[PDB]
Amino acid sequence: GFFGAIAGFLEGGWEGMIAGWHGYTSHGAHGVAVAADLKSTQEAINKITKNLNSLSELEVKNLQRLSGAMDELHNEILELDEKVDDLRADTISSQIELAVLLSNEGIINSEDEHLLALERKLKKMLGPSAVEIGNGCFETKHKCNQTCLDRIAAGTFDAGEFSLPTFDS
Amino acid sequence: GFFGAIAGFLEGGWEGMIAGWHGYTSHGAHGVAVAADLKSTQEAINKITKNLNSLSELEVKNLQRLSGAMDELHNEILELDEKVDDLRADTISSQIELAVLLSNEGIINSEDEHLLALERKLKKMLGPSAVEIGNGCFETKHKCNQTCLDRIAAGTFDAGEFSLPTFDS
Amino acid sequence: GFFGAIAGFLEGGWEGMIAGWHGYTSHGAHGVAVAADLKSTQEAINKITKNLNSLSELEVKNLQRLSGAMDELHNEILELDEKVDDLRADTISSQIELAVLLSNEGIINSEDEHLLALERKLKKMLGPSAVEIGNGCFETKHKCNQTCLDRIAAGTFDAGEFSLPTFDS
Amino acid sequence: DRICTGITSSNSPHVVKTATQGEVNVTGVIPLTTTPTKSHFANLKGTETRGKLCPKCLNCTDLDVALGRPKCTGKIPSARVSILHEVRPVTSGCFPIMHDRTKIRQLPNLLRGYEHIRLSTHNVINAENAPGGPYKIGTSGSCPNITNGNGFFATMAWAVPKNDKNKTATNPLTIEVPYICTEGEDQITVWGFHSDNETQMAKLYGDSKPQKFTSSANGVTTHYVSQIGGFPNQTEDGGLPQSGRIVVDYMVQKSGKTGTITYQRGILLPQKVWCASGRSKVIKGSLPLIGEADCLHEKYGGLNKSKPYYTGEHAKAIGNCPIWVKTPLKLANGTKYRPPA
Amino acid sequence: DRICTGITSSNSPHVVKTATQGEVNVTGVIPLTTTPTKSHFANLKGTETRGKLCPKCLNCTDLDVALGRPKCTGKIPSARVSILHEVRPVTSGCFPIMHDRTKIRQLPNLLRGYEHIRLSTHNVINAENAPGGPYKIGTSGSCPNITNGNGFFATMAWAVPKNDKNKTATNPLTIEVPYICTEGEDQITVWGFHSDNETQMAKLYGDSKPQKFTSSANGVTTHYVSQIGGFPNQTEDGGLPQSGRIVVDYMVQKSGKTGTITYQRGILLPQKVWCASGRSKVIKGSLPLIGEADCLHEKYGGLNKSKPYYTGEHAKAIGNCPIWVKTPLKLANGTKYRPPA
Amino acid sequence: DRICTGITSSNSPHVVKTATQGEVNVTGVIPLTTTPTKSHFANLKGTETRGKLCPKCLNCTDLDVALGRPKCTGKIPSARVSILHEVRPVTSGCFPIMHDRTKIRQLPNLLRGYEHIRLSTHNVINAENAPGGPYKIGTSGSCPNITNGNGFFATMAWAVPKNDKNKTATNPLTIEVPYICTEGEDQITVWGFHSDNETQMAKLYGDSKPQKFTSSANGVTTHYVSQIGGFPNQTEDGGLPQSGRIVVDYMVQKSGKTGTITYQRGILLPQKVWCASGRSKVIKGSLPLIGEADCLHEKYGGLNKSKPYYTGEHAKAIGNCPIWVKTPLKLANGTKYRPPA
Ligand SMILES: *[C@@H]1O[C@H](CO)[C@@H](O[C@@H]2O[C@H](CO)[C@@H](O[C@@H]3O[C@H](CO)[C@@H](O)[C@H](O)[C@@H]3O)[C@H](O)[C@H]2NC(C)=O)[C@H](O)[C@H]1NC(C)=O
Ligand SMILES: *[C@@H]1O[C@H](CO)[C@@H](O[C@@H]2O[C@H](CO)[C@@H](O[C@@H]3O[C@H](CO)[C@@H](O)[C@H](O)[C@@H]3O)[C@H](O)[C@H]2NC(C)=O)[C@H](O)[C@H]1NC(C)=O
Ligand SMILES: *[C@@H]1O[C@H](CO)[C@@H](O[C@@H]2O[C@H](CO)[C@@H](O[C@@H]3O[C@H](CO)[C@@H](O)[C@H](O)[C@@H]3O)[C@H](O)[C@H]2NC(C)=O)[C@H](O)[C@H]1NC(C)=O
Ligand SMILES: *[C@@H]1O[C@H](CO)[C@@H](O[C@@H]2O[C@H](CO)[C@@H](O[C@@H]3O[C@H](CO)[C@@H](O)[C@H](O)[C@@H]3O)[C@H](O)[C@H]2NC(C)=O)[C@H](O)[C@H]1NC(C)=O
Ligand SMILES: *[C@@H]1O[C@H](CO)[C@@H](O[C@@H]2O[C@H](CO)[C@@H](O[C@@H]3O[C@H](CO)[C@@H](O)[C@H](O)[C@@H]3O)[C@H](O)[C@H]2NC(C)=O)[C@H](O)[C@H]1NC(C)=O
Ligand SMILES: *[C@@H]1O[C@H](CO)[C@@H](O[C@@H]2O[C@H](CO)[C@@H](O[C@@H]3O[C@H](CO)[C@@H](O)[C@H](O)[C@@H]3O)[C@H](O)[C@H]2NC(C)=O)[C@H](O)[C@H]1NC(C)=O
Ligand SMILES: *[C@@H]1O[C@H](CO)[C@@H](O[C@@H]2O[C@H](CO)[C@@H](O)[C@H](O)[C@H]2NC(C)=O)[C@H](O)[C@H]1NC(C)=O
Ligand SMILES: *[C@@H]1O[C@H](CO)[C@@H](O[C@@H]2O[C@H](CO)[C@@H](O)[C@H](O)[C@H]2NC(C)=O)[C@H](O)[C@H]1NC(C)=O
Ligand SMILES: *[C@@H]1O[C@H](CO)[C@@H](O[C@@H]2O[C@H](CO)[C@@H](O)[C@H](O)[C@H]2NC(C)=O)[C@H](O)[C@H]1NC(C)=O
Ligand SMILES: *[C@@H]1O[C@H](CO)[C@@H](O[C@@H]2O[C@H](CO)[C@@H](O)[C@H](O)[C@H]2NC(C)=O)[C@H](O)[C@H]1NC(C)=O
Ligand SMILES: *[C@@H]1O[C@H](CO)[C@@H](O[C@@H]2O[C@H](CO)[C@@H](O)[C@H](O)[C@H]2NC(C)=O)[C@H](O)[C@H]1NC(C)=O
Ligand SMILES: *[C@@H]1O[C@H](CO)[C@@H](O)[C@H](O)[C@H]1NC(C)=O
Ligand SMILES: *[C@@H]1O[C@H](CO)[C@@H](O)[C@H](O)[C@H]1NC(C)=O
Ligand SMILES: *[C@@H]1O[C@H](CO)[C@@H](O)[C@H](O)[C@H]1NC(C)=O
Ligand SMILES: *[C@@H]1O[C@H](CO)[C@@H](O)[C@H](O)[C@H]1NC(C)=O
Ligand SMILES: *[C@@H]1O[C@H](CO)[C@@H](O)[C@H](O)[C@H]1NC(C)=O
Ligand SMILES: *[C@@H]1O[C@H](CO)[C@@H](O)[C@H](O)[C@H]1NC(C)=O
Ligand SMILES: *[C@@H]1O[C@H](CO)[C@@H](O)[C@H](O)[C@H]1NC(C)=O
Ligand SMILES: *[C@@H]1O[C@H](CO)[C@@H](O)[C@H](O)[C@H]1NC(C)=O
Ligand SMILES: *[C@@H]1O[C@H](CO)[C@@H](O)[C@H](O)[C@H]1NC(C)=O
Ligand SMILES: *[C@@H]1O[C@H](CO)[C@@H](O)[C@H](O)[C@H]1NC(C)=O
């Protein structure tokens, strides 16, 4: 969104993660590690599914032939019937299209905010061993390889292993 | 919302505060203190009230008997009249339902963001005497009891009393 | 919005910047410097223009005289025709008003978030030479005049010039 | 010591619908809905409200006024809103009419549709000079006038062919009905005919056999044929027993256009004529109209606007009204339900 | 070492619409749309579905059942939904009708409109005692009954005037048609007339010249006049050659109101009479109804509800239905397309 | 030194509506609205536009074309859009018609409704051989033809009963009107009759008394009776004084169905006949059509699409149009008003 473009968050994503929709990345002389966060993805999926149920519970009246009509006799009345049917279908269609458009807008705009929450979860398990860059990034005093990153993705990361100040639980 | 679940913000609230909708909490060997912020609550209340006025200013045409009708003579025309009335009421109803649904969505989703602002107001009066946890929490070098917390809720908290670096005003 | 009021972000803006919609400010004994950020403004402009195209692609059926009508003969049918037309124009109008209202709500609420991203871009080029105030502000160890600020607005600011820790690129 | 941010926990009985979170329990709510309660009908706030065609013509129903029954005449005032009380309107008197043989019963509800109504002045046609030979004009008891004694509907003249003379049966005579009203007014012409005993028929007119009639006004053609022998027992009439009966029809004449009637013996040639313009918004109510209301609902009568929307039986309604909704709706005033910790 | 946040990059063929970002390419999508396929018609799930007026009246069409043709009589059950299969319905026998000279053809489709239908009991009028002199009642082969042999429509009596006696031409006789049905039922009256050879006319009734007829029921007036010489070749009839033909019309009588008929020689006075109430939601389908469906679409026949909305030809549809939409719509399930880096 | 973030302060005259913040003052706005200005009527951009039934039949009005008045015949071309200029159409000549006694005046506006219109070829019936004895065909000055001298409407034949012979009064003769058009075309039949001086009537036909007429086409029945004595002063006619007048009606015959007419002396039997199919989208305009427009508004005439929506008088409009809105609407292009500090 506009947020990612302004704040300096990475333009474009990594194709390394087929595991989920959003995740974390490691840099260094150890190469480039990539991992995914399942709770973020699951939450997104729920937003969407609930959204769909909301769209699917819309109910509208039937539009059948009127009963005193008579094709031979009253055509003019009948033409007007046709008119009211067509007009209905049109209007209701527009309304629906709107509901969808709004819904999609929400789904897509929310994706920067997801990242912005992931930021806060990552900050949680560090200690002040890293500085907030504001880029959505931190600089850790140690090095982090793939196995090290999967443990942060799982939320099991607490470093006394790399011995640095711990945020107590 | 999704934000609170991802970022590690507290799942579930405290029933201690009947004062307002959103607030701050103190932990330690002094027990657990709870306080509320009135400006956040007032702001929420305003969002809502204005929202209501917006919903209440909707205006729609009248739907009365047509004047050339004649119950005895033209029933078929009249049946079609009935049709158009019913169809109108239905469509308009759906539209309204939508407007409301959207509105409620806004009201509920905004509540995480409220908390996210309260975070920034708390950070304001500390100094770098506390570290940003990202959990929506900080670790203060001193202890804070109830009377101490009410002063932060009132926004009157500035600590040279506990003597630690001050953010100047 | 509510965010600016709660978090302590500045109530009211500076009239110094005609360059863009959102920007940065410098304080000190050097006076008060003001600068604007073009990418934020451009992004806003795009949100809006695209929004407008979305509004402008709405299409609705025609509403002309029905062809078996006959002014002299069937007035009552004709009265009902009139009815259906009026009813249509009303409903569709309401729908449009709603679409607009929502759109505007988005445009205006997003403006705090813009500022919130600008915060992150500013934090990017400092180093930990400044502390996060949470007010949307930082305290830099050096002084910054107008020429110094235009370089941050342009994104060309990296300080080894004022020699303080650099965030590497 | 640690300092965090948090929201409230409390009793959360109210439920609300959201697109992203599904259906949630919430601290409080502002209801946007009401189910109103059936009341009597009232006067509409900003506006004229017409119940009775003319009030002050007392012991007179709307049909009576409309037919121009003697002693029922008066100012029929104007209304931007009218109420339709009688779905099958009735005469309170005068001469016996066989109502159901023509559309005549609806005439008052037709007049009611317009904003401006007035009986005409003068006459759309001279009955005595009409085609078919000079006519004496017939009157009957059961139709008393300002004075008392024999009379008839203002609306039409009962053409009885003079005296012995040339009195006999004729082939259909044709007649044009002039426009007579002003501007953009619709002109509603009332006319009809009269039958009797087989012997009375030969006494009055020259003829025993049935007589035939035709109306044509701007596209709308109608045809009638008389009954000779015994008719229905008299009803809604003025109360005096008569051997004969009367058929009454009206024909609308567009803005400017003339009209035609063809007839044989026993014709009632129209005299005074309805002149109408404007339009009034008609609803189905039931007098009396008591007090004021913001809204008039066909089902609920008088209504005052409370919340923006209402749940309930939907029907036609005029005035400042709440909008009908499928379900009672709630706007969320509060927070999402949070379990304590 | 630096640790940042990122989102995925992958193949993004699906496109979605968004107010702020314009039209974007996206990882995945949940389609909300379907273009259904034309299938045969079926039985609406929750509900009665009426195809044929009475089934079990075999070798009978709905018009046949409506007209009361001998051996077509049976329970016409009730439905909240009916299907209109014959746009121009037909007779399958009895006496030759000149269909096209009245509205009679639609009578079944009219009955169809109601939820509850029923032939009456007894007779709305005694034909033999009717005005115009005592009548023998006529029957014709081509109209066989339970037994076999000469009969007619249940719906009406063929008033032939007795025997030599007072047999001659009359001026129009007038007749009232009583209400006969219950409560809030509509009462549909079927009636008509009969013409023949010039010599046959003088043999049957007293008269060679044409005869004339009139129906009036609550505002609706109609007029008819007979043919004497050669008629159209017989059609949709019972198969036996006759020199004469028959004209049949129906007249609806509102809830409570009476009706009128005027006639000369050759009248078919109505006997049994339709009694209808309630209303059925009619669609244009084509039997047979096969199986069950959620939905009945006028274009697509049977339908099952799959996705909330559909794209395609729109028309009248009843039952649990998907909603019609201008364009196939997609809900976004995924992320914005991100080029790799 | 401190470095913060901030937004602009400036003149903020424009106001916009928001759900959360209420009504706010804003830096700038993009207006979505226009109030268009009444102009003359134009040609619709993408499409045919029919004003006059046939142009190139000059000194001929639409009604003239429609009735088939001599020298008014031509190609009536086809249009997906037509404009209704004459709300009460008029004849420019030929024989005097009493127009208001039938629906005849709308015929041109009826034809206009269709996309495809054509006069027929040949004749729907041989007038001279019609029932009632051999007929000479009548013509009159006031109806000149290509050459000049006596003629009549193409649309019908004036049946004058030969010479002395069997000339006398008859009882109603009946006649079938064949279908004659193609495929799914509607067939519009024009017919009518003629009256005169009492003595002229006995000179022409065998009869002084009035004659009676009937039309029946697929459910729609109409009845007429003639005038003998003095008629209205002649109007819209060809200018020569005649003692007699003419009544003209049309009857529409559905797709495939036949039609009926009954008549006595003075009948105009239909000859050529209208054949129509397709449908044209009619609006109420006023020639001439000048230039091109995107849109045709019934109130504003020609219109070009500028902004998506417009404020103003709403009515029927065809083409690429802006959408009508209750209030002039603004999209926000800017920031919330900020007081300087
Ligand atoms: C109100 O009703 C009274 C009767 O109750 C009406 O008075 C009647 O007026 C008519 C003429 O309008 C009188 O008829 C005349 O009879 C005389 C012979 O006596 C004859 O010379 C005239 O040529 C005419 O035929 C009738 O006698 C008279 N009734 C009485 C008893 O006076 C009165 O006209 C009604 N008022 C209005 C304005 O309608
Ligand atoms: C309807 O026609 C009937 C005949 O079919 C008419 O009947 C007549 O009615 C009157 C009133 O009942 C009878 O008059 C009374 O007769 C007695 C004896 O003659 C006399 O003492 C009374 O002074 C009075 O005149 C009359 O005799 C009776 N006629 C017959 C044939 O019985 C009735 O008049 C007709 N109504 C109409 C409006 O013409
Ligand atoms: C089915 O059709 C047959 C004829 O094909 C019907 O039989 C007929 O019944 C009527 C009376 O219902 C008979 O009329 C009677 O004539 C005798 C004199 O012979 C007379 O005494 C009676 O007063 C009455 O007028 C008629 O003769 C008879 N036809 C024959 C040849 O038997 C039968 O009624 C029909 N079935 C039903 C139930 O409708
Ligand atoms: C319709 O009217 C025609 C006359 O215009 C009637 O024609 C008659 O038809 C029957 C049957 O074809 C003929 O009867 C047969 O005649 C021969 C010789 O007389 C006899 O051998 C047979 O046993 C049988 O009766 C009859 O002669 C014929 N009449 C004439 C004038 O040719 C027909 O009956 C009429 N239909 C109606 C229903 O009345
Ligand atoms: C335009 O009008 C003229 C008359 O003003 C039409 O000329 C007429 O044509 C008819 C036949 O089409 C002539 O009738 C004929 O009369 C003769 C006896 O003289 C007879 O032999 C024929 O069997 C037929 O009955 C009529 O006389 C003639 N009028 C004159 C005075 O010449 C002309 O047909 C019209 N043009 C068109 C093309 O319609
Ligand atoms: C309508 O009927 C009237 C009669 O009611 C017919 O009147 C006749 O009109 C013509 C023209 O004005 C008169 O003809 C002229 O008469 C004088 C003297 O006889 C003669 O010098 C002229 O050469 C010319 O023929 C005619 O006399 C007059 N008849 C009478 C009874 O006054 C008129 O013809 C009728 N119109 C129709 C179309 O038949
Ligand atoms: C959310 O709202 C509903 C309010 O109806 C609560 O569910 C009801 O609980 C009451 C308690 O007496 C029962 O009587 C009703 O039968 C329940 N309604 C139904 C049909 O579900 C629910 O408990 C609320 N959730 C909370 C308290 O958070
Ligand atoms: C609608 O609102 C007004 C409130 O004033 C009601 O009108 C008043 O009714 C009371 C009697 O109950 C009188 O004392 C006032 O004088 C009335 N005002 C006028 C101008 O009529 C009205 O009855 C309400 N209708 C309802 C409650 O349905
Ligand atoms: C976004 O979506 C469309 C899907 O249609 C892609 O454009 C199509 O690419 C295919 C590749 O074979 C072509 O065959 C179609 O002709 C294209 N559609 C049209 C008419 O534009 C597009 O490439 C996608 N963008 C991506 C991959 O990000
Ligand atoms: C709509 O859904 C039901 C799914 O069961 C279909 O009805 C079944 O059809 C099959 C035969 O194809 C039978 O075995 C079942 O017994 C039927 N159920 C009933 C109660 O009728 C129905 O055919 C579907 N309609 C479609 C696919 O258009
Ligand atoms: C917000 O917008 C309106 C624009 O109309 C301003 O109010 C108007 O101020 C002008 C100044 O001349 C007056 O003439 C109008 O009478 C005012 N309009 C009404 C009826 O309120 C308002 O000042 C603007 N607010 C600002 C400047 O922030
Ligand atoms: C990651 O580093 C750890 C030691 O900290 C080691 O156990 C593991 O094998 C490493 N993973 C890879 C695949 O290099
Ligand atoms: C909170 O601590 C302060 C001293 O800092 C004291 O004045 C006050 O009484 C304490 N409040 C309670 C209720 O313990
Ligand atoms: C800003 O300071 C720089 C030196 O750091 C100087 O070059 C420049 O002139 C200053 N700008 C102004 C206008 O004071
Ligand atoms: C109205 O009619 C009634 C009933 O016939 C009668 O009692 C009363 O006197 C009449 N009132 C007037 C004003 O004539
Ligand atoms: C008409 O009145 C007579 C008594 O005079 C009565 O016997 C008969 O039942 C009445 N008819 C009607 C239609 O009520
Ligand atoms: C139905 O009619 C057909 C065709 O005339 C015939 O073959 C069959 O026997 C009839 N069936 C019944 C039940 O009468
Ligand atoms: C009627 O039948 C005869 C044969 O008897 C035939 O010649 C004629 O064409 C038929 N008429 C019609 C309308 O088909
Ligand atoms: C059109 O004919 C009318 C008479 O019908 C005449 O007044 C006018 O001069 C005519 N125009 C032409 C061009 O001849
Ligand atoms: C008809 O014409 C005559 C003059 O010949 C005139 O006196 C009379 O007023 C006219 N009638 C009409 C209807 O204008
Ligand atoms: C619409 O646009 C075109 C521009 O070329 C022009 O021909 C036409 O006159 C315009 N109509 C108007 C301005 O109403």
Side-chain angles (χ1 to χ4, degrees), chain E residues 122-137:
Chain E
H122 324 85
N123 287 331
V124 283
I125 204 194
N126 192 211
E128 300 176 355
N129 289 337
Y135 298 143
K136 80 156 64 102
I137 287 181

mmCIF file of all heavy atoms in Angstrom, chain E residues 122-137:
data_model
loop_
_atom_site.group_PDB
_atom_site.id
_atom_site.type_symbol
_atom_site.label_atom_id
_atom_site.label_comp_id
_atom_site.label_asym_id
_atom_site.label_seq_id
_atom_site.Cartn_x
_atom_site.Cartn_y
_atom_site.Cartn_z
ATOM 1 N N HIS E 122 -74.026 -26.734 -7.670
ATOM 2 C CA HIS E 122 -75.226 -26.203 -8.268
ATOM 3 C C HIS E 122 -74.854 -25.287 -9.421
ATOM 4 O O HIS E 122 -73.885 -25.486 -10.127
ATOM 5 C CB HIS E 122 -76.067 -25.432 -7.237
ATOM 6 C CG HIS E 122 -76.043 -26.027 -5.863
ATOM 7 N ND1 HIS E 122 -75.052 -25.739 -4.948
ATOM 8 C CD2 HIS E 122 -76.885 -26.891 -5.247
ATOM 9 C CE1 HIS E 122 -75.283 -26.403 -3.829
ATOM 10 N NE2 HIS E 122 -76.389 -27.107 -3.984
ATOM 11 N N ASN E 123 -75.604 -24.221 -9.522
ATOM 12 C CA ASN E 123 -75.833 -23.475 -10.750
ATOM 13 C C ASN E 123 -76.118 -22.006 -10.471
ATOM 14 O O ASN E 123 -76.863 -21.710 -9.535
ATOM 15 C CB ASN E 123 -76.946 -24.028 -11.645
ATOM 16 C CG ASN E 123 -76.580 -25.310 -12.375
ATOM 17 O OD1 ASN E 123 -75.421 -25.586 -12.704
ATOM 18 N ND2 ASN E 123 -77.618 -25.976 -12.843
ATOM 19 N N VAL E 124 -75.558 -21.069 -11.215
ATOM 20 C CA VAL E 124 -75.715 -19.709 -10.789
ATOM 21 C C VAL E 124 -77.011 -19.201 -11.314
ATOM 22 O O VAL E 124 -77.397 -18.092 -11.021
ATOM 23 C CB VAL E 124 -74.581 -18.773 -11.235
ATOM 24 C CG1 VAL E 124 -73.344 -18.938 -10.399
ATOM 25 C CG2 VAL E 124 -74.283 -19.000 -12.743
ATOM 26 N N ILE E 125 -77.707 -20.019 -12.095
ATOM 27 C CA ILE E 125 -78.994 -19.607 -12.649
ATOM 28 C C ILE E 125 -79.738 -20.753 -13.327
ATOM 29 O O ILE E 125 -79.134 -21.593 -13.994
ATOM 30 C CB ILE E 125 -78.827 -18.453 -13.656
ATOM 31 C CG1 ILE E 125 -80.131 -17.662 -13.779
ATOM 32 C CG2 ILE E 125 -78.393 -18.989 -15.012
ATOM 33 C CD1 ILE E 125 -80.175 -16.741 -14.979
ATOM 34 N N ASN E 126 -81.056 -20.774 -13.152
ATOM 35 C CA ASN E 126 -81.901 -21.775 -13.792
ATOM 36 C C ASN E 126 -82.149 -21.388 -15.245
ATOM 37 O O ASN E 126 -82.834 -20.405 -15.528
ATOM 38 C CB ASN E 126 -83.222 -21.942 -13.041
ATOM 39 C CG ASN E 126 -83.999 -23.163 -13.494
ATOM 40 O OD1 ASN E 126 -85.230 -23.175 -13.464
ATOM 41 N ND2 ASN E 126 -83.283 -24.199 -13.915
ATOM 42 N N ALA E 127 -81.584 -22.164 -16.163
ATOM 43 C CA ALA E 127 -81.679 -21.860 -17.590
ATOM 44 C C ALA E 127 -83.087 -22.006 -18.130
ATOM 45 O O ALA E 127 -83.537 -21.176 -18.924
ATOM 46 C CB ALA E 127 -80.713 -22.729 -18.387
ATOM 47 N N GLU E 128 -83.786 -23.043 -17.688
ATOM 48 C CA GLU E 128 -85.104 -23.336 -18.265
ATOM 49 C C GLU E 128 -86.142 -22.258 -17.936
ATOM 50 O O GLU E 128 -87.037 -22.007 -18.731
ATOM 51 C CB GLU E 128 -85.608 -24.728 -17.873
ATOM 52 C CG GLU E 128 -84.663 -25.839 -18.359
ATOM 53 C CD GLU E 128 -85.049 -27.244 -17.930
ATOM 54 O OE1 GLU E 128 -86.023 -27.401 -17.159
ATOM 55 O OE2 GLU E 128 -84.371 -28.201 -18.372
ATOM 56 N N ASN E 129 -85.986 -21.597 -16.784
ATOM 57 C CA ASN E 129 -86.954 -20.602 -16.306
ATOM 58 C C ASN E 129 -86.460 -19.203 -16.684
ATOM 59 O O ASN E 129 -87.009 -18.212 -16.230
ATOM 60 C CB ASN E 129 -87.171 -20.718 -14.796
ATOM 61 C CG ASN E 129 -87.942 -21.965 -14.412
ATOM 62 O OD1 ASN E 129 -88.675 -22.531 -15.224
ATOM 63 N ND2 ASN E 129 -87.781 -22.402 -13.168
ATOM 64 N N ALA E 130 -85.418 -19.113 -17.508
ATOM 65 C CA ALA E 130 -84.810 -17.801 -17.693
ATOM 66 C C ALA E 130 -85.774 -16.925 -18.489
ATOM 67 O O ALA E 130 -86.756 -17.427 -19.063
ATOM 68 C CB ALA E 130 -83.466 -17.900 -18.438
ATOM 69 N N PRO E 131 -85.499 -15.626 -18.524
ATOM 70 C CA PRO E 131 -86.346 -14.677 -19.255
ATOM 71 C C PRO E 131 -86.302 -14.922 -20.759
ATOM 72 O O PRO E 131 -85.222 -15.101 -21.322
ATOM 73 C CB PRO E 131 -85.716 -13.324 -18.923
ATOM 74 C CG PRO E 131 -85.083 -13.528 -17.589
ATOM 75 C CD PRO E 131 -84.590 -14.948 -17.583
ATOM 76 N N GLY E 132 -87.467 -14.927 -21.397
ATOM 77 C CA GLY E 132 -87.552 -15.148 -22.829
ATOM 78 C C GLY E 132 -88.372 -16.374 -23.179
ATOM 79 O O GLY E 132 -88.403 -16.804 -24.332
ATOM 80 N N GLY E 133 -89.039 -16.940 -22.178
ATOM 81 C CA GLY E 133 -89.862 -18.118 -22.380
ATOM 82 C C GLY E 133 -89.154 -19.396 -21.974
ATOM 83 O O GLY E 133 -87.927 -19.486 -22.039
ATOM 84 N N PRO E 134 -89.931 -20.387 -21.551
ATOM 85 C CA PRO E 134 -89.374 -21.676 -21.128
ATOM 86 C C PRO E 134 -88.395 -22.235 -22.156
ATOM 87 O O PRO E 134 -88.668 -22.189 -23.355
ATOM 88 C CB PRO E 134 -90.609 -22.574 -21.036
ATOM 89 C CG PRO E 134 -91.565 -21.987 -22.017
ATOM 90 C CD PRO E 134 -91.338 -20.503 -21.973
ATOM 91 N N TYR E 135 -87.267 -22.756 -21.684
ATOM 92 C CA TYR E 135 -86.244 -23.326 -22.578
ATOM 93 C C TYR E 135 -85.994 -24.818 -22.398
ATOM 94 O O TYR E 135 -85.709 -25.270 -21.305
ATOM 95 C CB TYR E 135 -84.892 -22.599 -22.339
ATOM 96 C CG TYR E 135 -84.919 -21.118 -22.644
ATOM 97 C CD1 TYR E 135 -84.220 -20.212 -21.871
ATOM 98 C CD2 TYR E 135 -85.685 -20.630 -23.690
ATOM 99 C CE1 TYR E 135 -84.279 -18.853 -22.138
ATOM 100 C CE2 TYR E 135 -85.761 -19.279 -23.964
ATOM 101 C CZ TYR E 135 -85.058 -18.391 -23.191
ATOM 102 O OH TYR E 135 -85.144 -17.050 -23.495
ATOM 103 N N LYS E 136 -86.039 -25.587 -23.472
ATOM 104 C CA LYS E 136 -85.427 -26.893 -23.396
ATOM 105 C C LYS E 136 -83.923 -26.694 -23.419
ATOM 106 O O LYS E 136 -83.426 -25.738 -23.981
ATOM 107 C CB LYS E 136 -85.881 -27.774 -24.549
ATOM 108 C CG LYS E 136 -85.160 -27.533 -25.886
ATOM 109 C CD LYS E 136 -85.208 -28.795 -26.820
ATOM 110 C CE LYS E 136 -86.646 -29.211 -27.277
ATOM 111 N NZ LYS E 136 -87.009 -28.803 -28.690
ATOM 112 N N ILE E 137 -83.184 -27.589 -22.800
ATOM 113 C CA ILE E 137 -81.736 -27.464 -22.790
ATOM 114 C C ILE E 137 -81.039 -28.322 -23.845
ATOM 115 O O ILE E 137 -81.194 -29.545 -23.875
ATOM 116 C CB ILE E 137 -81.167 -27.827 -21.433
ATOM 117 C CG1 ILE E 137 -81.485 -26.709 -20.432
ATOM 118 C CG2 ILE E 137 -79.663 -28.109 -21.539
ATOM 119 C CD1 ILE E 137 -80.937 -26.961 -19.014
#
